[PDB]
Design a protein around this ligand. Structure first.
Ligand SMILES: CC(=O)N[C@@H](Cc1ccccc1Cl)C(=O)N1CCC[C@]12C=C[C@@H]1CC[C@@H](C(=O)N3CCC[C@@H]4C=C[C@H]5CC[C@@H](C(=O)O)N5C(=O)[C@H]43)N1C2=O
Length: 113
């Protein structure tokens, strides 16, 4: 938390999860809109996670570990995505600057893990 984790970036993005059964992206957490998406570094054990909160109502729409070896796909300059055993996640960034901020922090996490 506040004492164990440190934010290494903030970026604006609509967070989406892939509905594998329907072959469609769905808003993470149930409602379409932009979130503030952090990567948080647990400095103690050198782990990272992605945490995003809807700007409007503060709902946490994503909270997922970044595992070592993750393949992070920059599909376009403003839409990046990744997978784990359970979900495919997509970040539709509000600008290329946000995309670069977040990708730059994710790529750091992946090299230091
Ligand atoms: C082997 C594998 O798993 N491959 C993954 C990718 C991957 C590769 C390597 C490592 C991890 C991963 Cl994750 C894969 O390809 N995946 C993950 C499931 C989703 C998808 C599969 C098919 C569709 C084709 C279309 C494409 C897609 O979704 N978009 C294209 C460009 C961005 C464009 C942007 C936004 C969203 C807003 C909704 C819709 C729209 O804009 O209307 N849309 C889009 O159309 C978006 N797909 C994918 O990304």
């Amino acid at each position: 938390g506040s004492m164990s984790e440190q934010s290494i970036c903030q970026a604006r993005a609509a967070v989406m999860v892939y509905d594998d059964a329907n072959k469609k992206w769905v808003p993470a957490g149930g409602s379409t809109g932009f979130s503030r998406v952090h990567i948080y570094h647990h400095t103690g054990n050198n782990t990272f996670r992605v945490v995003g909160r809807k700007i409007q109502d503060h709902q946490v729409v994503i909270n997922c570990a970044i595992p070592k070896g993750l393949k992070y796909n920059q599909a376009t300059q403003t839409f990046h995505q990744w997978r784990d055993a359970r979900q495919v996640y997509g970040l539709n960034f509000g600008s290329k600057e946000d995309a670069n901020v977040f990708a730059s922090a994710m790529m750091h996490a992946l090299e230091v893990l």
